[PDB]
Amino acid sequence: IAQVQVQNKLQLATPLLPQEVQRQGIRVTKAVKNFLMVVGVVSTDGSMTKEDLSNYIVSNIQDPLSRTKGVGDFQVFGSQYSMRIWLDPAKLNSYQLTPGDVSSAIQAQNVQISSGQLGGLPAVKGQQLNATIIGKTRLQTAEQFENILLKVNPDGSQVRLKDVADVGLGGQDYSINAQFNGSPASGIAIKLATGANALDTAKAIRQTIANLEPFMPQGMKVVYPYDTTPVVSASIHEVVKTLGEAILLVF
Amino acid sequence: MSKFFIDRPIFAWVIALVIMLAGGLSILSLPVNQYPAIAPPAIAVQVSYPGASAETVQDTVVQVIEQQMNGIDNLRYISSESNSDGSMTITVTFEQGTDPDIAQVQVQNKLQLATPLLPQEVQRQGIRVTKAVKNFLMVVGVVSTDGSMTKEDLSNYIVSNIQDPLSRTKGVGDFQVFGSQYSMRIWLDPAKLNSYQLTPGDVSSAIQAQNVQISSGQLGGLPAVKGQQLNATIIGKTRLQTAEQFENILLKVNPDGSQVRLKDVADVGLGGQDYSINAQFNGSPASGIAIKLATGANALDTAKAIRQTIANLEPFMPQGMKVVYPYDTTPVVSASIHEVVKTLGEAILLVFLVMYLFLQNFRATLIPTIAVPVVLLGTFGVLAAFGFSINTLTMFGMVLAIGLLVDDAIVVVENVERVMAEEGLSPREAARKSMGQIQGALVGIAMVLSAVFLPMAFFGGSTGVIYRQFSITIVSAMALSVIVALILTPALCATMLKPIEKGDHGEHKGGFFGWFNRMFLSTTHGYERGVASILKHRAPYLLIYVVIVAGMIWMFTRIPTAFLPDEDQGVLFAQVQTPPGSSAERTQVVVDSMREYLLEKESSSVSSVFTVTGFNFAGRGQSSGMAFIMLKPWEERPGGENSVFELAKRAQMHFFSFKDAMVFAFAPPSVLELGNATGFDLFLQDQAGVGHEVLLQARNKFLMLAAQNPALQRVRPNGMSDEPQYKLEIDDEKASALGVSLADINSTVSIAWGSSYVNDFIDRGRVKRVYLQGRPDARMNPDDLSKWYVRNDKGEMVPFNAFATGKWEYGSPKLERYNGVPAMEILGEPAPGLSSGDAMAAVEEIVKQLPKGVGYSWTGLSYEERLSGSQAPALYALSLLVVFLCLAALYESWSIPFSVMLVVPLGVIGALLATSMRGLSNDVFFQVGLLTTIGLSAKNAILIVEFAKELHEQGKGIVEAAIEACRMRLRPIVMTSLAFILGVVPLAISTGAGSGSQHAIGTGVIGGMVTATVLAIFWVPLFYVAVSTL
Amino acid sequence: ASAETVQDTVVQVIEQQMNGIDNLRYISSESNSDGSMTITVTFEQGTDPDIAQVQVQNKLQLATPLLPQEVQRQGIRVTKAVKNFLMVVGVVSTDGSMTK
Amino acid sequence: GYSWTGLSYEERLSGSQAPALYALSLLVVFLCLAALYESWSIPFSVMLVV
């Protein structure tokens, strides 16, 4: 009920936020203050850099580890890929262009639009053809992405995004990037959901990562650099064995 | 506890009156519906993003929503659906026990945290979040007989002026209508757009420039100038109402006065909103309402209120419009509670009859007719105390409970009358002696019956709820029957009985009753020497007992296991699939021919066909359709000639000859909430290997080996086969080299072919919306792309074939996901006569060949059935341990409870034999009938072994007392037995509403109880002497 | 906007969708020439107000696809409302120099 | 048509609710005095001295 109340008092205010923070995804979670455990991933062949095995956890490990029982909020050390368009003002002066023109071209030339149907309804009486018509799909690879047009004169001379900027896939924020035991690594810091225990949540996290284990590439382990469940399990076991020896001493 | 009230009866009588008064107050405030909340609470999210591809709506809506919901409570699994028609459906399925309101508001909140990331064309549609629980009370269907009104006119008429009185009535919850209201549909044409140098971007700008509210202020608004005396709420422009106000909006005008209206550019006129769906009822075009029931509300008087609302609205409808009721689960509930009231009356009158038949007096015969309705009314009160509702399940639990519910009062009045007969005491002290002899026995009945039914309540899932209803109802019946037979019945046996003197049984009476007394003591003192002969040498009879225990083991191993019995529900589903690349009229030619076959030659069974195209349980679009054919009631089709499970075969043997489309007919399950499968469900999701073609080859390999195994049968894909779809390739350098802007091309191809939501208008005081497309003869051909014109920057028209070449592709029209990765769903059925776990093992064996990167995940009912398969051989052994504890408590040893817990095999043997002879399955109804006949066998076994112990405590041997106790206690067994099968047999011999449930719940009970009596009354003192020689 | 267009735009739709909640007694509404509206749905006594607010803004959400775009941009404020004023706390200027 | 609200609906509920209160409490006193003293004379005495 507390999350629902702060959520409607947040949706009362979220259109008054700026336009670019509104397109980032606002998160409201029931997270307690401590880090429960950190599911870490380190590569053992050296072919994986920091950003690629952060991309792997964000794209494949994060969401099954986020639907599970008792995980409120994550904290991913790194992030996924996001293909960046590295402008430079020398070649941006070379063709008399502003970055607003580039930002309008890369909003007008990779869109996935409502196209309709080739035999859509209502049909003229006596029409027996149907096909889902396809407009432009969104651009996937970088060599397909370099062919974004920016300006072209009617005599046939054009400029491309490959001539203005140097495109390439990389992270979306290079601020945080961990490293485990010397090697390049990353991980996802898991916070516990409130009103729930820690051992069942940790066991569900272990079962989820063990279900996702047979699909990761070769040269990529899963390690646990930080967890607070073995201390509490050892404390419970120590008090149970203290009880089991105290009953024998009373006997 | 009973000796304290047998002296003073008025206090016990007003305790019973308080119980009956609380029950009578609870009767008029119980909610009542067909099925309780047994489905897992699933939440649907439906978007109607118009004119999209099958992967456009997916990669712009579904992944954006599914990667932003993170950390909702009690989440089990989520799904998706990205149809080619443009819709979307994700079904967030939660854990049991979660009330749907907070789960729905949490998925609402974590959806509206994601809705700014969704595109503008999606977030102007509005993202609807409703509860997906398929329990429809009644389906109000509106038709138009003459054919002058299409479906969208009927849907506007519904949403206009029959939705206003319907939702203001009591008890009606949330509901949906087929289709929606009108929309000012604006039909552009490309020749007139060429003729004026126009583009649909200019029309879409001028409409939303001349059809908006303008926030004008006030004439004298604050702050006022010093000396202001005037105030008037000024208003500016207003939303346009009619179509002759959209005809007079202007697109451009020169300063000479030469203008261009929306006339001679467009053809405005009110039409529908979603043209894809199209339903028709017996020929006439039809819309409808699907009314659900709100929580905590009666179904009968609210259905009558819906009937009364329609019957009070009917003098105002247009001519040619009937309101029909195709689907209505009001008479199912009504007949299912009416048969319970009839069998209550039959049970009390029939136990009155057998109580007068075996005992000669009338006053002692009258007392079950008082002592049974008090616990009958009070169990509704202490059923309302837990927050339940009158279901079908708890009413059949009541009917299971009646025959044992009467037995406590029967054995009380029998013991009082036989203590009256044998020694001749005054009634209060004779009933005092009887109650002092049944003191521990009645609380032993309470503890043993609670121990044998309460662990059955502790399952988890839909299985857990459908056992929990049964268990809590009959445990409430036990725990209230024991106290109303320990507290009430001796207090009235001390008052309203007739004394009998010493050594008399009524031998010189004459007539029929003297003959009955003579034959009854004749078979009694023949039974004396019979049990003496079978107990005098008892060695070759325990061998027969262990042979018949091998009989129950190798008789229960044989029969197959079922989840729910097959039911005559009343409906049949007939979903069709035309070959890919088919329009709507081919599907309609299949559908109306199927409809006229099911009405013309099948007038004996099918009452009406509410059929529909563009929709099935497989996947939406234009090349699909169904026929919700709905049978006649049970009182108009006698015999087994017109059942649903024969009408399906008689329809399918002709639907094999409809050679246009694969017409498929399947019966719904017992419960429609978790239904539509009758088997197992599986998603073949991919975790690592990326590619739609690889997963399509995986499903092809899986369907190749699925039809080869004999353990699998009728294995179909739930998705859709691939449609041949048409693509464009807009040559962007040749487009922008001619001079057109690519945003103008995107707006033209997004407004001309597919629709585009602009803004809202106001008609009849109601906000409706405005779409626009091209004409229904301006987008219908691949060569008709050469007719639309984008605008160059010089002011001249550029044709669309100058820079766009066509090419045909082959893609999927329905891409669905499962927990964030794409998948394809099957709908599997087990082999006829094989268990469901055997089919699950034989279908998880096939997954050992799929390519590297394609996983499997269970769903539907199999996710509960796989995880719930580890408690049933745990808590049954727990319940046997608890009943061993209770019988060690009552009988002061550790070996004498074996003389009771070796008797319930003799109760399960007859039930297994009676449900193996007439061909039934091992469903939940036979299992709870098995449990209640086990409970009745333990019920009379502990009383006969307790008198066998008591007569040995009197001071005689084992052999004399074991045949003394059965001699003294034969007649309550034949009272219980004769009244029991006379009360239960009219369930099995009859039919009607819920025939399969009654046949599954009656014949195992009578076959178990008759065999339990005829073996227990001969073998229980043999077990007692065999355990007492140790 | 004026009162009748606010009524027939917003209030009729949410009035149509906010009946059928359990333990409901009467729903009533207002509109103004200023433009504001106030639906004041009143439950039967015996209901937890938290789950009542949960159900109210649960079945409020499927009116948003019917309401226009000048009201979706501002957000709907739901709250539990008693009718008494418990306390009015107000400042006052003893200098006489500063205005309202 | 007219429909009461605010204070008026609550006091109309009181007016339609009071005789059930009188009859049900009178019957509960009747049941308790038939309960504890176990006669059918003195509960009629209290029910016609009320």
Side-chain angles (χ1 to χ4, degrees):
Chain A
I1 306 299
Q3 182 180 1
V4 171
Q5 288 174 355
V6 306
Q7 189 66 51
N8 70 12
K9 297 293 183 182
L10 182 64
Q11 76 179 358
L12 192 150
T14 186
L16 297 177
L17 273 71
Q19 186 66 41
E20 204 274 331
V21 73
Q22 188 176 2
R23 294 178 67 189
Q24 294 292 322
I26 306 170
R27 293 186 57 83
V28 173
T29 58
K30 294 184 287 184
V32 292
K33 292 178 69 67
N34 56 358
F35 286 163
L36 178 63
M37 65 181 290
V38 175
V39 173
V41 165
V42 64
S43 65
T44 186
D45 286 332
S47 66
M48 302 297 174
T49 185
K50 293 181 181 180
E51 295 293 327
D52 192 74
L53 61 90
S54 180
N55 188 16
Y56 177 69
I57 61 171
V58 176
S59 67
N60 288 317
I61 300 299
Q62 179 180 0
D63 289 330
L65 185 146
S66 180
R67 275 100 171 96
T68 189
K69 180 65 68 68
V71 171
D73 187 71
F74 56 88
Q75 182 63 256
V76 177
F77 294 152
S79 180
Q80 60 185 355
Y81 284 177
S82 295
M83 64 183 298
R84 297 176 68 91
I85 303 168
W86 298 108
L87 294 173
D88 52 353
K91 296 185 290 293
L92 192 66
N93 194 12
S94 298
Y95 306 111
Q96 294 179 357
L97 294 170
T98 184
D101 196 1
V102 181
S103 178
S104 295
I106 65 175
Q107 285 180 355
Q109 300 189 6
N110 53 357
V111 287
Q112 195 168 3
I113 49 178
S114 177
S115 297
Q117 292 179 357
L118 188 64
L121 287 86
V124 64
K125 184 174 72 68
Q127 192 272 333
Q128 292 175 355
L129 179 62
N130 191 4
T132 302
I133 192 166
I134 294 171
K136 294 189 291 294
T137 61
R138 287 184 291 176
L139 274 65
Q140 297 182 357
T141 60
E143 287 84 4
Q144 184 177 2
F145 197 83
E146 289 178 351
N147 293 319
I148 290 171
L149 276 77
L150 278 71
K151 69 185 288 185
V152 51
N153 292 318
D155 59 355
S157 67
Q158 76 274 18
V159 306
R160 301 292 181 90
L161 189 63
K162 67 179 75 174
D163 288 329
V164 173
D166 195 0
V167 80
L169 277 77
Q172 71 184 0
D173 48 352
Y174 295 96
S175 179
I176 54 173
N177 44 1
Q179 56 185 356
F180 173 68
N181 203 358
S183 296
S186 72
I188 173 168
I190 301 165
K191 290 191 284 185
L192 184 63
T194 185
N197 53 1
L199 272 303
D200 291 330
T201 299
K203 184 178 183 293
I205 291 166
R206 298 290 175 88
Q207 192 269 331
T208 300
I209 192 65
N211 197 2
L212 270 297
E213 183 180 1
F215 295 100
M216 59 184 68
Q218 292 183 357
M220 185 175 287
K221 294 189 265 77
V222 283
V223 295
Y224 299 101
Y226 179 75
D227 52 353
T228 62
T229 55
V231 52
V232 307
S233 67
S235 177
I236 295 301
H237 181 75
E238 186 70 27
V239 181
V240 167
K241 294 298 289 184
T242 301
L243 181 65
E245 293 179 354
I247 185 169
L248 190 145
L249 288 172
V250 172
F251 181 75
Chain B
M1 188 175 179
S2 178
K3 293 169 71 71
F4 183 76
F5 288 168
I6 198 168
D7 197 1
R8 296 179 292 172
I10 309 298
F11 183 70
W13 184 260
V14 300
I15 284 174
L17 186 58
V18 164
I19 292 297
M20 187 177 73
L21 183 65
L25 291 174
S26 296
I27 285 297
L28 58 89
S29 179
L30 278 170
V32 46
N33 50 4
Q34 186 180 3
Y35 290 103
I38 68 171
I43 306 300
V45 171
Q46 294 180 357
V47 185
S48 296
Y49 178 59
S53 298
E55 70 269 15
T56 294
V57 61
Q58 185 185 5
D59 291 332
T60 58
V61 177
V62 180
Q63 294 180 359
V64 177
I65 292 173
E66 286 181 353
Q67 75 181 0
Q68 293 291 322
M69 52 177 67
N70 286 318
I72 56 174
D73 288 331
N74 298 115
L75 177 58
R76 184 179 285 175
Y77 62 92
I78 64 167
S79 298
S80 72
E81 181 176 1
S82 298
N83 295 318
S84 68
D85 191 71
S87 67
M88 190 275 284
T89 299
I90 57 172
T91 62
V92 177
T93 300
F94 289 96
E95 188 68 27
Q96 294 293 110
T98 299
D99 48 350
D101 53 356
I102 60 172
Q104 189 182 3
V105 76
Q106 282 179 354
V107 67
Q108 172 187 354
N109 288 320
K110 291 186 183 293
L111 180 142
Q112 65 92 26
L113 284 173
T115 192
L117 289 170
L118 276 71
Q120 187 69 41
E121 292 291 327
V122 186
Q123 70 184 357
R124 289 186 295 173
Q125 294 293 322
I127 314 298
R128 185 179 295 112
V129 177
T130 59
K131 293 182 286 292
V133 174
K134 274 79 69 178
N135 49 2
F136 295 104
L137 181 62
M138 62 186 292
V139 178
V140 173
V142 176
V143 301
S144 67
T145 61
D146 57 354
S148 66
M149 294 175 71
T150 184
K151 186 181 76 68
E152 297 294 327
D153 195 359
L154 268 67
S155 294
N156 191 16
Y157 185 76
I158 289 171
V159 177
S160 179
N161 57 5
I162 76 172
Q163 190 177 2
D164 294 332
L166 185 66
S167 180
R168 291 195 297 270
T169 60
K170 184 176 71 68
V172 175
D174 53 353
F175 58 94
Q176 66 181 357
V177 297
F178 294 96
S180 294
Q181 61 186 357
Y182 278 181
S183 297
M184 185 64 74
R185 178 76 70 180
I186 292 172
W187 297 106
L188 298 176
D189 53 353
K192 298 291 181 68
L193 292 173
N194 192 6
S195 178
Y196 292 156
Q197 283 82 17
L198 288 172
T199 184
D202 196 1
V203 178
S204 179
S205 295
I207 291 168
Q208 68 185 357
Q210 297 181 359
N211 194 2
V212 292
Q213 284 294 110
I214 302 301
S215 297
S216 296
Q218 289 179 355
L219 296 178
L222 273 301
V225 71
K226 300 286 103 175
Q228 178 55 253
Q229 304 297 322
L230 183 63
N231 191 4
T233 304
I234 191 170
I235 55 172
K237 291 181 71 67
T238 314
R239 273 79 175 271
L240 285 308
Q241 289 84 17
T242 60
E244 289 86 4
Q245 293 182 358
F246 283 98
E247 288 179 354
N248 292 116
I249 62 170
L250 53 92
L251 299 173
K252 68 179 182 179
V253 55
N254 291 320
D256 189 74
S258 67
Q259 64 183 357
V260 175
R261 299 288 186 183
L262 194 62
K263 294 185 264 75
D264 294 329
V265 173
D267 290 330
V268 301
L270 284 81
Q273 185 176 1
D274 44 2
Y275 282 148
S276 296
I277 195 69
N278 193 0
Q280 59 182 356
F281 181 80
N282 291 322
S284 296
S287 178
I289 305 171
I291 297 169
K292 289 171 66 67
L293 186 64
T295 62
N298 184 354
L300 276 74
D301 60 357
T302 59
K304 290 181 182 179
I306 295 168
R307 297 286 180 88
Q308 185 61 255
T309 299
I310 300 300
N312 287 319
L313 197 147
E314 60 90 19
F316 291 98
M317 291 188 286
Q319 185 68 41
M321 177 179 286
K322 292 192 265 75
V323 175
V324 72
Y325 299 102
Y327 182 72
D328 191 0
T329 61
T330 301
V332 174
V333 182
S334 180
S336 179
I337 64 171
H338 181 71
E339 189 174 1
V340 177
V341 176
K342 286 175 71 175
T343 192
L344 287 176
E346 178 67 28
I348 59 97
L349 187 145
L350 183 55
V351 73
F352 180 78
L353 194 278
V354 70
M355 180 65 200
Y356 185 75
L357 202 281
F358 292 181
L359 284 175
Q360 296 297 111
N361 54 4
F362 182 76
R363 292 179 182 270
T365 307
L366 189 62
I367 65 96
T369 317
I370 297 169
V372 177
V374 289
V375 64
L376 280 175
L377 269 73
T379 189
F380 289 110
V382 298
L383 186 66
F386 292 103
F388 283 168
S389 65
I390 295 169
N391 299 318
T392 303
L393 280 303
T394 188
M395 280 295 176
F396 282 110
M398 289 294 292
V399 178
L400 286 171
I402 299 312
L404 201 151
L405 189 72
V406 73
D407 290 331
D408 289 331
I410 290 304
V411 70
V412 164
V413 69
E414 192 276 332
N415 196 5
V416 174
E417 186 67 29
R418 65 99 173 174
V419 171
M420 185 74 74
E422 64 91 17
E423 194 68 28
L425 281 75
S426 69
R428 63 181 296 274
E429 63 185 1
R432 185 183 294 275
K433 182 178 183 291
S434 71
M435 280 296 170
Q437 199 169 7
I438 312 300
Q439 286 297 320
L442 291 178
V443 296
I445 290 297
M447 293 297 172
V448 164
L449 273 298
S450 66
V452 78
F453 294 121
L454 283 172
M456 179 263 284
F458 292 162
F459 286 163
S462 66
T463 304
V465 183
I466 65 173
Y467 280 104
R468 185 173 60 88
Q469 298 292 321
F470 281 156
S471 66
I472 299 299
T473 299
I474 66 178
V475 163
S476 175
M478 299 301 170
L480 200 67
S481 179
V482 170
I483 60 98
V484 301
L486 185 64
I487 295 303
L488 176 65
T489 57
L492 49 86
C493 284
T495 61
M496 58 183 74
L497 265 69
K498 190 261 189 295
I500 303 298
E501 63 184 2
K502 178 68 179 293
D504 288 330
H505 295 285
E507 295 297 317
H508 61 278
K509 184 67 69 178
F512 179 74
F513 289 160
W515 180 69
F516 185 73
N517 194 4
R518 287 191 296 272
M519 65 88 72
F520 185 74
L521 60 83
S522 180
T523 188
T524 302
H525 73 271
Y527 180 79
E528 295 175 1
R529 293 180 181 177
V531 70
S533 179
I534 69 170
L535 192 145
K536 187 175 176 66
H537 293 90
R538 65 187 184 273
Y541 293 157
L542 194 276
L543 185 65
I544 299 170
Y545 175 73
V546 70
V547 164
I548 207 66
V549 169
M552 66 164 281
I553 295 297
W554 283 274
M555 201 71 197
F556 186 77
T557 307
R558 196 268 304 275
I559 59 170
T561 63
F563 179 73
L564 286 173
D566 294 331
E567 291 291 327
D568 187 78
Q569 185 63 257
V571 298
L572 186 64
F573 294 157
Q575 59 93 30
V576 304
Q577 287 180 356
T578 57
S582 177
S583 66
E585 66 182 2
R586 291 180 64 190
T587 303
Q588 290 180 357
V589 167
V590 174
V591 158
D592 64 354
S593 66
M594 172 169 65
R595 189 264 316 285
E596 67 182 1
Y597 176 71
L598 289 172
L599 290 177
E600 195 268 329
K601 288 180 71 67
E602 196 64 31
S603 178
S604 177
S605 296
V606 175
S607 177
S608 68
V609 178
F610 183 76
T611 187
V612 63
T613 65
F615 178 74
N616 56 6
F617 291 100
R620 299 180 71 253
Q622 188 178 359
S623 67
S624 296
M626 291 187 70
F628 295 98
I629 61 172
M630 295 181 184
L631 278 300
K632 290 182 180 180
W634 296 269
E635 65 183 1
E636 292 179 353
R637 50 182 180 91
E641 293 179 353
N642 292 319
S643 178
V644 175
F645 292 98
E646 196 271 331
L647 189 274
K649 294 180 176 66
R650 186 169 64 241
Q652 187 62 256
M653 289 179 71
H654 192 202
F655 291 159
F656 286 163
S657 179
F658 284 163
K659 63 182 181 180
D660 197 3
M662 288 185 287
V663 182
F664 185 75
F666 63 96
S670 300
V671 177
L672 194 145
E673 296 178 354
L674 51 90
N676 296 319
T678 66
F680 62 94
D681 297 330
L682 180 64
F683 283 99
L684 276 74
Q685 64 186 359
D686 53 349
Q687 297 294 322
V690 179
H692 185 74
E693 296 294 327
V694 177
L695 198 148
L696 185 63
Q697 296 295 321
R699 192 185 70 189
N700 288 319
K701 185 67 68 69
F702 184 77
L703 269 297
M704 186 183 76
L705 287 194
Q708 185 174 359
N709 288 318
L712 278 74
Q713 187 268 332
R714 195 179 68 190
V715 176
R716 64 186 184 274
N718 201 4
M720 290 177 69
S721 65
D722 297 334
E723 294 290 328
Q725 65 185 359
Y726 184 77
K727 79 176 292 294
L728 291 174
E729 47 181 0
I730 299 168
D731 195 0
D732 53 357
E733 60 183 0
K734 197 260 178 66
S736 184
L738 294 175
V740 299
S741 65
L742 293 171
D744 198 359
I745 298 171
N746 288 320
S747 67
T748 302
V749 77
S750 178
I751 294 169
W753 288 266
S755 65
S756 68
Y757 178 79
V758 178
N759 52 2
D760 297 332
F761 77 105
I762 293 170
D763 52 349
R764 296 290 188 270
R766 186 176 295 113
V767 172
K768 296 182 185 178
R769 61 186 66 186
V770 176
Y771 291 100
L772 77 163
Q773 291 181 356
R775 286 181 65 88
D777 59 354
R779 65 184 186 273
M780 302 302 291
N781 287 317
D783 288 331
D784 205 79
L785 305 174
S786 175
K787 198 180 286 183
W788 291 94
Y789 291 98
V790 300
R791 184 176 67 190
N792 196 359
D793 60 354
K794 295 180 177 67
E796 61 188 1
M797 290 293 107
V798 176
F800 190 78
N801 57 356
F803 58 91
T805 61
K807 183 173 73 69
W808 291 90
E809 281 185 349
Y810 185 76
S812 179
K814 180 177 177 180
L815 284 79
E816 66 270 16
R817 303 173 69 87
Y818 187 78
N819 288 319
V821 292
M824 285 178 182
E825 189 177 1
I826 67 167
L827 293 174
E829 182 72 28
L834 277 73
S835 178
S836 179
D838 195 2
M840 288 176 68
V843 78
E844 72 182 2
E845 184 67 29
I846 308 171
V847 195
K848 294 180 182 179
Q849 67 174 356
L850 294 177
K852 181 170 69 179
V854 174
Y856 68 101
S857 295
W858 294 99
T859 186
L861 273 300
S862 296
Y863 185 79
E864 189 270 330
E865 190 177 1
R866 185 176 177 87
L867 294 175
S868 67
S870 295
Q871 293 179 356
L875 52 85
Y876 287 162
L878 180 62
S879 180
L880 268 71
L881 197 278
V882 178
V883 70
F884 177 72
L885 288 178
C886 294
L887 295 177
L890 198 149
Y891 289 106
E892 199 183 357
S893 180
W894 290 98
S895 65
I896 191 168
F898 292 160
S899 67
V900 176
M901 66 185 65
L902 291 176
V903 181
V904 301
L906 305 176
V908 71
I909 286 160
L912 292 173
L913 290 173
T915 55
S916 66
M917 284 178 71
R918 67 179 291 167
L920 292 175
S921 63
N922 192 1
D923 53 353
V924 299
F925 295 155
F926 172 68
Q927 184 169 358
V928 67
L930 187 149
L931 289 174
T932 190
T933 187
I934 281 173
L936 196 278
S937 296
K939 175 176 179 66
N940 56 5
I942 64 167
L943 270 73
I944 189 168
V945 75
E946 185 171 358
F947 284 116
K949 185 180 179 181
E950 183 68 28
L951 268 297
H952 179 70
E953 193 179 2
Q954 291 297 110
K956 65 179 73 174
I958 300 296
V959 180
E960 185 178 1
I963 66 169
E964 176 68 29
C966 190
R967 183 177 74 187
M968 188 170 71
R969 287 294 309 275
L970 183 139
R971 61 181 301 164
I973 314 300
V974 68
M975 275 285 283
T976 290
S977 178
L978 187 62
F980 192 81
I981 53 100
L982 261 292
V984 174
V985 162
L987 273 75
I989 200 66
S990 179
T991 186
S995 298
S997 66
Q998 298 176 0
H999 291 89
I1001 208 166
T1003 185
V1005 170
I1006 58 169
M1009 201 283 304
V1010 171
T1011 305
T1013 298
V1014 79
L1015 289 175
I1017 68 171
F1018 290 97
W1019 287 352
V1020 172
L1022 191 147
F1023 287 113
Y1024 175 69
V1025 65
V1027 76
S1028 295
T1029 55
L1030 276 75
Chain C
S2 65
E4 65 271 15
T5 179
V6 170
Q7 182 184 3
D8 291 330
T9 296
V10 176
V11 180
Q12 184 177 1
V13 177
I14 303 174
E15 179 72 21
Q16 179 54 250
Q17 293 189 2
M18 281 187 178
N19 52 5
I21 305 101
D22 52 355
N23 299 115
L24 185 62
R25 184 180 290 173
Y26 62 93
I27 61 174
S28 64
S29 66
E30 291 176 353
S31 296
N32 290 317
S33 66
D34 185 74
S36 178
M37 53 86 72
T38 302
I39 291 176
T40 172
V41 46
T42 300
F43 291 98
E44 185 68 26
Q45 193 273 331
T47 304
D48 194 1
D50 291 331
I51 62 170
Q53 183 179 1
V54 164
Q55 289 174 353
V56 166
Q57 65 179 348
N58 194 2
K59 62 177 69 176
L60 175 60
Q61 196 270 332
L62 55 95
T64 304
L66 296 175
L67 269 64
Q69 294 85 24
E70 296 180 354
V71 71
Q72 294 177 357
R73 189 262 183 190
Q74 290 171 350
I76 298 169
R77 179 174 63 246
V78 295
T79 183
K80 54 182 70 66
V82 295
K83 290 190 284 184
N84 53 2
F85 283 161
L86 191 274
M87 185 180 289
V88 174
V89 175
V91 296
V92 69
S93 66
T94 61
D95 198 2
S97 66
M98 63 186 292
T99 182
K100 295 178 183 179
Chain D
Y2 67 99
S3 294
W4 300 98
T5 188
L7 281 77
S8 297
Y9 187 78
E10 293 179 354
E11 57 89 28
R12 184 63 61 86
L13 186 63
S14 178
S16 67
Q17 193 175 4
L21 171 61
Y22 292 117
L24 206 153
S25 178
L26 194 66
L27 192 275
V28 167
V29 176
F30 180 76
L31 288 179
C32 185
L33 283 175
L36 187 61
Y37 292 162
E38 296 163 350
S39 178
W40 297 98
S41 66
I42 59 97
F44 286 97
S45 296
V46 304
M47 291 297 103
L48 61 92
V49 82
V50 165

